[PDB]
């Protein structure tokens, strides 16, 4: 389901911000996960150009530069 698939997203910050913050944060701390900041909510929380619209070209430049 949408809730189940959202809670098991690869970027742990999205799941931590959405629902069951304790149960997701504990899992991410145990597993030693590493977020890539790929989606939209992650870049919203961080405060960058979201890779959605006008910032998509900037995100492409920043990704292909490395």
């Amino acid at each position: 389901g949408i809730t189940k698939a959202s809670l098991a997203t690869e970027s742990f910050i999205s799941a931590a911000s959405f629902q069951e913050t304790t149960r997701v944060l504990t899992e991410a701390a145990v597993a030693g996960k590493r977020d890539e900041l790929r989606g939209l909510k992650e870049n919203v929380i961080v405060g960058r150009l979201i890779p959605a619209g006008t910032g998509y070209a900037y995100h492409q430049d920043r990704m292909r530069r490395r």
Binding site: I45, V46, G47, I50, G53, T54
Partner: protein
């Protein structure tokens, strides 16, 4: 006959049915409840006496000394209501109780006593309710809303459906106490009956059975009947009851006396039972295999060795039958276990029962209540005795006991507070009976199970809690005190009672701030029924069924009035005629109907007694004899309506108006509006603001007079008489000689209330509505209050509306308003608001109220005096200085931005120790002079009246009228008169005049003390200056406008006089509404109100025309009589013959503004009457007239509706809502802008807002809205510098709120960090 307050402007009424019961006093619940709470009542029935006798007397732990209660008394309040509102202190009275301490002599626990010492000890300080139904707690006025909570008693809930995921209905029994622990019984999916107290955990009820010292013998005998097996030669014949065999299958061949009655496999039909009763047989044969499905009742022991063979409650098999047959147990008793009639739930619970005896059961109960603590037998016994068998820890009220007994079909209605064994046993029997199938559950929305806890009982509970705390304190103190020297105050601490009472009345969920912006709002706020608060449910865990209306709400609770939002249906409003039971239940009046005649005796029927009878409906025609003209009258029998006969009814509704509340009854033509647009209409009638010149509503209801006289703003005349002196600040009556007292009669003076701040910053203002030498009757208005008119609730103005689109300026719901509307000064409203500038003696030195402020020129200090305060009467503008306060190194109070006004009142409060300034002593001297002048004037008035009475007495018994003038007015008491009773009366009046002089001097000295005293303040402030502005809010595009039918809207443009459409007579239209707001929101009643208002204004215009050119009284009287007799069968029946040719000219002058029409709620006008009234004038029957375009000047090519609809003005003013924010203040824990308008805070671009920017893909703007504009610290200033440098560019850093999240996560055991 009609009084003078009614023969000044008589409202035309369209009521068909007559009213035999007038509306009662509206806010009669609060004053009655508090009277029951405070009145000196013997026998411990009501009030503080009941709580005292339920708590006191106290004796220590064998301390030989008792502190017993005697009586209580309240002293006079320290400050009156005006002083309490001005200062900010509670309007309370000290609580003095004359407690006494008694100790017996040694070696005599019941013999003689040692000594008694008694004094009126001061403990606690309880608030007093004013004469208008509200308290004054901290200067502000609060109203304690009544609570609608679950009645104490026994409740058999169902929990149908959603449990167990199979549809298996459970059954749970609840015993809710008034004060104590819950006793929830419930079943199990495995058909086990588990008790659960205080929602801890489940356990079999047989545990509490053995806790009641019941052996399994007693339980099995109590819950089940017996079937006897007798030892004989063999085959174990069965004792049989004929009725026991109803509706099952014969497992064998049923036979008796040899012959076979029912064949094997055949069911036992009712004829078989009847024939077996006819044959009168009881002993039958049975195979021993049928004994397998039987359980033995009591334990069996051997008669030879004394050893238990089979204990209580176990099955019987062939081996057990063989063992018992050889032993010699002749009588075998077994349980009669059925499958649908009597289930063996008790046996199953005994099977799952963990305990076996009383001691183990008590230890298990102790383990359940307090887990992990080592239990002993004495502690468990004391705990279980305290839970359900003690009046100090558990108490069902009298209403709880009554509900408990009537729910179990008992005859007795009274009883003890605690339960008993039989009560719990009866609850168990009733629950099992419901489980079997006989009877049914009781819903918790049937209003005969929900009480009303009013103000008095809420205060009783809090006072009882404080008394319990003081009880514990004195119990601790009295066991370690030195006797013979302890006065009854050293042990009584006055802190906890007063603290608890103040906490309740000041900070609670039901000590609501009074919604007081107009009389209707306050009078319906006092008549509120809130289901929230302590002891009730919360909006989150509230089922959708509780919101829904129950059929028992009819007459007790308004069905159509409840606030929108989260708390809808939980904040129900009280009906008009609804009352309160002595038990706290709701009941509504009814007229008792005899065999065929409707009697006029009113009976109040509770929510439960209504369903037993059949009740007629109010809109049923009667003909002068209590007879129904129809043979089939509509009625309601049991929560449902069906056609009935005139012979079966025994009750009929008092009036149609009893269904709706007082708030919803003021809407005319309510029976045509949809209730959806009636709820909002009632709310926006509740939220109206008083205008400048209050104006009566044309299409009224006739209840506006009741609301105006009941809400208390109008100065209702206590005693009738003649107005001796009227003034803008006081009214004086020379009362009629019939109602004067023998002594202390004099006259009475009404002190009006001038422009003072209200609880919602509106303007309350009492103004005179009577003239000099006007005879006033008893119980009639004298002073027009806020938004009233001659004792009639006038919440707005009558405006000439027109339903037509106008260039889209009334597009969706907007309202287009003429310039003439504000030219006439109709909707401009006064707004008194206060500004307080405390002077805190904070660190680095105290702060001054000096009149010189550094680095600010004399431009802003011109209005200020040399003292530091602003002059009274200054026309201040936004941003100016009101009081100059500077702290040791500029923090002076200023008028807020964008508000004008005029300072009308400045009050200064100073500490006892900080001396004064010149302005404070100026205000003090002004107050002293005003108080002395007021007292001197009032005593001069009353002594003029007193000597007038003296002179009236002297005229009999040797009078000489000429010498009264030349003899000085001092010695008017010993003048010529003999020694009869008149001389005694004269001496009595001389004595009362001497007492008047004494009270003058003593009360003037007391007022001097009250004004000159310190008036202490909060710790940490030197002096307080309160500035009272006076804002005149004109009408402007942006504020809400709404009629009574829930047709709201916002003014969009103010057109000039000429631009708006005008009829063929050139009269401009004030408001151009939108027609499409009629059909889609089904408030059709606004059209009928518009038509009736048009007819009323046509009649008023004809009266004005006939009065302009002066015609004789005959024509005016004839026309007015034609108008008032136009109704078909109205019960107005006013005759102008009794009018004396002078009091009809006043009526005709008052009708020139428009004839006021009444319209009862569900007995309103019909369109035939409306069209007849239209035809009375010269108006078209269609209701629509012809208007020409204001700008274009050509005909509008359709007739349009024009009339006078009562148009309210809501106090959702746009300048109270207009707001903007540049760079400004910021929060502390997170670097974000503040929230709110008082703080200079910005709007919230919330979680849902960001998706609306990701959706467009506009990433850069989103990045400014949550990185550089709000959150970060360095980029926040960098962007500001860039904006004021000409360079529009953003340099984002990191949001500070993300660093806050990182730090708060690292505060845990989690390590979050940023990579490279």
């Amino acid at each position: 006959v009609y009084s003078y307050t009614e023969k000044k402007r008589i409202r035309k009424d369209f009521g068909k049915r007559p009213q035999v019961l007038d509306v009662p006093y509206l806010l009669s619940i609060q004053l009655d409840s508090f009277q029951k709470f405070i009145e000196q009542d013997p026998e411990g029935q009501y009030g503080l006496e009941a709580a005292f006798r339920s708590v006191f007397p106290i004796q220590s732990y064998s301390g030989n000394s008792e502190l017993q209660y005697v009586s209580y008394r309240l002293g006079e309040p320290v400050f009156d209501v005006q002083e309490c509102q001005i200062r900010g202190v509670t309007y309370s009275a000290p609580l003095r109780v004359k407690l006494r301490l008694v100790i017996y002599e040694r070696e005599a626990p019941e013999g003689t006593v040692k000594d008694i010492k008694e004094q009126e000890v001061y403990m606690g300080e309880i608030p007093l309710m004013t004469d208008n139904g509200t308290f004054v707690i901290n200067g502000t006025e609060r109203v304690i809303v009544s609570q609608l909570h679950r009645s104490p008693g026994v409740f058999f809930d169902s929990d149908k459906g959603k449990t167990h995921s199979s549809g298996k209905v459970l059954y749970n029994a609840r015993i809710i106490p008034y004060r104590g622990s819950w006793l929830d019984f419930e079943f199990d999916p495995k058909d086990n009956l588990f008790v659960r107290i205080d929602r801890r955990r489940k356990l079999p009820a047989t545990i509490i059975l053995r806790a009641l010292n019941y052996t399994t013998e007693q339980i099995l005998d109590l819950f089940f009947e017996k079937v006897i097996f007798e030892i004989r030669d063999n085959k174990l014949q069965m004792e049989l009851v004929p009725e026991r065999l109803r509706g099952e299958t014969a497992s064998f061949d049923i036979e008796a006396n040899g012959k076979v009655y029912v064949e094997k496999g055949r069911r036992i039909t009712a004829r078989h039972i009847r024939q077996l009763e006819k044959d009168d047989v009881k002993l039958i044969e049975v195979p021993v295999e049928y004994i397998a499905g039987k359980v033995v009742a009591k334990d069996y022991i051997d008669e030879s060795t004394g050893e238990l063979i089979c204990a209580a409650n176990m099955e019987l098999s062939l081996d057990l039958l063989a063992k018992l047959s050889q032993s010699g147990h002749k009588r075998i008793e077994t349980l009669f276990t059925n499958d649908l009639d009597h289930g063996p739930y008790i046996s199953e619970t005994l099977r799952v029962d963990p305990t076996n005896d009383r001691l183990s059961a008590l230890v298990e109960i102790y383990r359940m209540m307090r887990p992990g603590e080592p239990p002993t037998r004495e502690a468990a016994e004391s705990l279980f005795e305290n839970l359900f068998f003690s009046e100090d820890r558990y108490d069902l009220s009298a209403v709880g006991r009554m509900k408990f007994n009537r729910s179990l079909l008992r005859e007795e209605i009274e009883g003890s507070g605690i339960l008993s064994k039989d009560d719990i046993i009866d609850v168990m029997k009733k629950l099992i009976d419901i489980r079997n199938g006989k009877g049914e559950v009781d819903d918790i929305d049937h209003l005969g199970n929900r009480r009303i806890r009013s103000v008095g009982e809420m205060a009783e509970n809090q006072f009882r809690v404080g008394l319990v705390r003081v009880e514990r304190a004195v119990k601790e103190r009295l066991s370690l005190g030195d006797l013979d020297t302890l006065m009854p105050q050293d042990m009584i601490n006055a802190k906890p009672i007063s603290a608890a009472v103040k906490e309740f009345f000041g900070s609670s969920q039901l000590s609501q701030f009074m919604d007081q912006n107009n009389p209707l709002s306050e009078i319906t706020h006092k008549r509120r029924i809130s289901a929230l608060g302590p002891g009730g449910l919360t909006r989150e865990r509230a089922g959708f069924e509780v919101r829904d209306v129950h059929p028992t709400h009819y007459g007790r609770v308004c069905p159509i009035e409840t606030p929108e939002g989260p708390n809808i249906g939980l904040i129900n409003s009280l009906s008009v005629y609804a009352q309160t039971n002595e038990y706290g239940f709701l009941e509504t009046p009814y007229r008792k109907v005899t065999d065929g005649v409707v009697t006029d005796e009113i009976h109040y029927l509770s929510a439960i007694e209504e369903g037993n009878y059949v009740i007629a409906q109010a809109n049923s025609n009667l003909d002068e004899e209590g007879h129904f003209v129809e043979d089939l009258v509509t009625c309601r029998s049991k929560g449902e309506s069906s056609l009935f006969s005139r012979d079966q009814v025994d009750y009929m509704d008092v009036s149609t108006q009893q269904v709706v509340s007082v708030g919803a009854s003021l809407i005319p033509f309510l029976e045509h509006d949809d209730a959806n647009r009636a709820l909002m209409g009632a709310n926006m009638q509740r939220q109206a603001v008083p205008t400048l010149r209050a104006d009566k509503p044309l299409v009224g209801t006739g209840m506006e007079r009741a609301v105006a006289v009941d809400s208390g703003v109008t100065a209702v005349a206590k005693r009738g008489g003649v107005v001796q002196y009227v003034d803008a600040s006081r009214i004086v009556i020379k009362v009629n000689e019939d109602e004067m007292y023998p002594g202390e009669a004099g006259i009475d003076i009404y002190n009006l209330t001038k422009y003072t701040r209200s609880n919602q910053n509106t303007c309350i203002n009492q103004m005179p509505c009577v003239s000099l030498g006007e005879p006033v009757e008893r119980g009639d208005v004298l002073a027009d209050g806020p938004s009233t008119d001659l004792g009639e609730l006038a919440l707005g103005q009558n405006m000439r509306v027109a339903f037509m689109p106008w260039n889209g300026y009334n597009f969706e719901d907007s309202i287009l308003v003429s310039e003439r509307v504000v030219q006439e000064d109709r909707f401009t409203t006064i707004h008194i608001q206060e500004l307080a500038c405390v002077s805190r003696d904070t660190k680095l030195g105290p702060e001054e109220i000096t009149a010189d402020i550094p680095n600010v020129g004399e431009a802003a200090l011109s209005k200020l005096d040399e003292s530091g305060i602003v002059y009274i009467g200054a026309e201040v503008t936004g941003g100016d200085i009101l009081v100059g306060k500077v702290t040791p190194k500029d923090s002076s109070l200023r008028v807020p931005n964008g508000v004008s006004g005029t300072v009308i009142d400045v009050q200064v409060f100073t500490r006892d120790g900080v001396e004064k300034d010149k302005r404070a002593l100026e205000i003090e001297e002004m107050q002293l002079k005003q108080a002395k002048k007021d007292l001197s004037e009032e005593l001069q008035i009353l002594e003029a009246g007193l000597f007038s009475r003296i002179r009236a007495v002297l005229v009999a018994g040797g009078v000489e009228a000429e010498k009264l003038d030349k003899l000085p007015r001092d010695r008017w008491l010993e003048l010529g008169l003999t020694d009869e009773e008149k001389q005694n009366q004269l001496e009595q009046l001389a004595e009362q005049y001497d007492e008047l002089k004494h009270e003058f001097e003593k009360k003037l000295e007391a007022k001097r003390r009250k004004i000159t005293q310190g008036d202490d303040l909060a710790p940490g402030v030197l002096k307080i200056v309160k500035v009272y502005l006076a804002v005149k809010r004109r009408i402007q595009p942006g504020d809400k406008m709404a009629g009574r039918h829930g047709n709201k809207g916002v003014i969009s443009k103010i057109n000039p006089i000429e631009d708006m459409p005008y009829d063929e007579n050139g009269t401009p239209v004030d408001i151009v509404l939108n027609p499409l707001g009629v059909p889609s929101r089904m408030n059709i009643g606004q059209i009928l109100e518009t038509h009736l208002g048009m007819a009323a204004k046509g009649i008023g215009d004809k009266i004005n025309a006939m009065l302009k050119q002066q015609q004789e009284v005959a024509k005016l009287r004839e026309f007015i009589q034609r108008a008032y007799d136009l109704g078909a069968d109205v019960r107005q029946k006013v005759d102008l013959s009794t009018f004396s040719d002078e009091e009809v000219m006043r009526l005709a002058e008052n009708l020139r503004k428009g004839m006021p029409i009444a319209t009862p709620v569900f007995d309103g006008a019909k369109e035939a009457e409306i069209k007849e009234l239209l035809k009375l004038g010269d108006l078209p029957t269609s209701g629509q007239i012809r208007l020409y375009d204001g700008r274009t000047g050509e005909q509008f090519e359709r007739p349009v509706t024009v009339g006078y609809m009562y148009m309210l003005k809501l106090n959702h003013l746009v300048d109270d809502k207009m707001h903007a924010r540049s760079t400004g203040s910021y929060s502390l824990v997170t670097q974000q802008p503040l929230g709110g308008k008082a703080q200079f805070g910005g709007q919230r671009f919330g979680e849902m807002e960001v998706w609306a920017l990701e959706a467009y893909g506009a990433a850069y703007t989103l990045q400014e809205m949550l990185t550089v504009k709000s959150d970060d610290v360095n980029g926040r200033t960098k962007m500001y510098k860039n904006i004021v440098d000409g360079n529009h560019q953003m340099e984002p850093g990191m949001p500070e709120s993300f660093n806050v999240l990182l730090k708060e996560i690292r505060s845990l055991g989690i390590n979050i960090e940023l990579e490279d």
